[PDB]
Ligand binder design. Sequence first.
Ligand SMILES: CC(C)(CO)[C@@H](O)C(=O)OP(=O)(O)OC[C@H]1O[C@@H](n2cnc3c(N)ncnc32)[C@H](O)[C@@H]1O
Ligand SMILES: CC(C)(CO)[C@@H](O)C(=O)OP(=O)(O)OC[C@H]1O[C@@H](n2cnc3c(N)ncnc32)[C@H](O)[C@@H]1O
Lengths: 283, 283
Amino acid sequence: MTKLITTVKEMQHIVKAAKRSGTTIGFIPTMGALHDGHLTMVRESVSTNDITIVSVFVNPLQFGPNEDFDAYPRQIDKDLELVSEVGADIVFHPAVEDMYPGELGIDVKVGPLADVLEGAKRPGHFDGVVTVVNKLFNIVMPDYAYFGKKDAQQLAIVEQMVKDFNHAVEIIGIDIVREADGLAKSSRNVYLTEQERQEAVHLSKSLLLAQALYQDGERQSKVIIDRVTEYLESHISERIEEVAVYSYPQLVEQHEITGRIFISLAVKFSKARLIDNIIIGAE
Amino acid sequence: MTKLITTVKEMQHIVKAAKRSGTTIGFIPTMGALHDGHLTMVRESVSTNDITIVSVFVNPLQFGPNEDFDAYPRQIDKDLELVSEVGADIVFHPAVEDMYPGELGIDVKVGPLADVLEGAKRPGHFDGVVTVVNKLFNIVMPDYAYFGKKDAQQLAIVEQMVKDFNHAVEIIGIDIVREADGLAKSSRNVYLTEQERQEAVHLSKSLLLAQALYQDGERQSKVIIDRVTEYLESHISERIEEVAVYSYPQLVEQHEITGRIFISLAVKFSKARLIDNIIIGAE
Ligand SMILES: CC(C)(CO)[C@@H](O)C(=O)OP(=O)(O)OC[C@H]1O[C@@H](n2cnc3c(N)ncnc32)[C@H](O)[C@@H]1O
Ligand SMILES: CC(C)(CO)[C@@H](O)C(=O)OP(=O)(O)OC[C@H]1O[C@@H](n2cnc3c(N)ncnc32)[C@H](O)[C@@H]1O
């Protein structure tokens, strides 16, 4: 019995009334094709907030010319069903023209945090992310917004935006939800051929390896990177786009580990470009 | 009787509590050194909203190295008194470091609307304006935000930012409040020498001239501009920086008038740089 709100105007009118009353709002922004990674955040919100809102919007601004915008899975009826069973109050599913009624007269761009890793590999991608997340925060006016550590760089950037723009929103980061074999859940996994689906499991395996090496005491980035790379290269035939060690959330490449870092991966299959990571350390 | 709130943290805390209690909020952003122009907006807000918040913050981001940042009038005690007399609830007076704790990680820049008139003469100025207003809107969470048409280009840009970012804020623009002789009120008038003060009255008089020419049927921008310019040059010794006719709020230069426009002026005195304008026309 989850309500489907289709326009920005109706969504905002609902939230303004809720905000001016004492009702706490939980928000989970998504691009649809929901999986248990998304649902885990929804369940969290439903057990903590008065109302939980889930947005389903494939944001064109965060897709590059040669990426998968046209093939991105779109299944609102199912998403709506999956959300209903969790107990979420509303699913916000706006039209593209409603979100972007015309040429933007103001532009938002990410600084240094987007000059490395995914930001360097997908130029402008995060500018598109912060643009739509900023709008969604103003449309839904949540007290708590949930994001997955699956997109670690994204998380750090959204946090920076919340700080820089003074959004009265507390960001909650959830750990990576994985399939039974370890594969990090992602709507894009549907792009995987029955073969790639098997090879793709090695991203997580390689991270388990990285974790064990770190656990035993290894702190030289190059040693971990080489072991992880060597492993992947002997278990997958796809092209490995990235195997890096950066401080987190600062995003400064580390050669020797003495603080909190995240070991991230990027692998390009036929059409599915998957990513995974592990955030570890204290400082 | 007005409370002086000195930190972002406390201001947000108060605002959150206000929202929870169904409090409607009116907001008047200013750079201090208040005059009746500002007070007119405060009065309007006090008569409509449950609480009225007036921010006093000389935003360093909207001042260039060559401008008057160091001389800008600062008199919080005086501002607090004037605001108390009209019934404002709070004066938000933050530290520069509190608003900008460090290097921004996200950057906001105005598009085409800032490529002309004041935007061309003051590059970066409006980026500074939208940056701080965006922040203030998220800190104060107003239902209504008041701005003066004195800064007509600013007003159009703020409205555009409200649209693009989906801010649940209604912008209220007020007409230009003037001194008895016609001079538009401005905190920068304090920079005028006795001589320049009387000369400055001609900016408004030149606009009355422009209006009369328009009333009579003149639609050739060149004719109005030349008439206004020669009038100013024959009455004041200062440099006329700008006399222009652009569509409003579209801000497209008009050589021949067939719709709503605004005739704007910019005059540079020894220290004070004054502006004024009139908005006229149907569409
Ligand atoms: C924020 C968006 C909606 C803005 O367009 C967009 O950039 C976006 O990310 O949408 P989307 O790709 O649909 O993912 C939405 C949220 O789900 C989280 N997520 C995805 N897979 C996960 C997993 N296996 N475990 C835990 N969390 C997971 C992401 O970190 C993100 O915050
Ligand atoms: C919005 C700010 C605070 C962001 O830093 C800054 O750009 C700013 O504008 O500050 P400030 O110059 O102090 O002016 C604050 C508000 O007062 C309005 N105002 C000034 N003189 C007026 C007059 N004579 N009649 C009517 N309205 C008048 C302006 O248009 C502006 O919206």
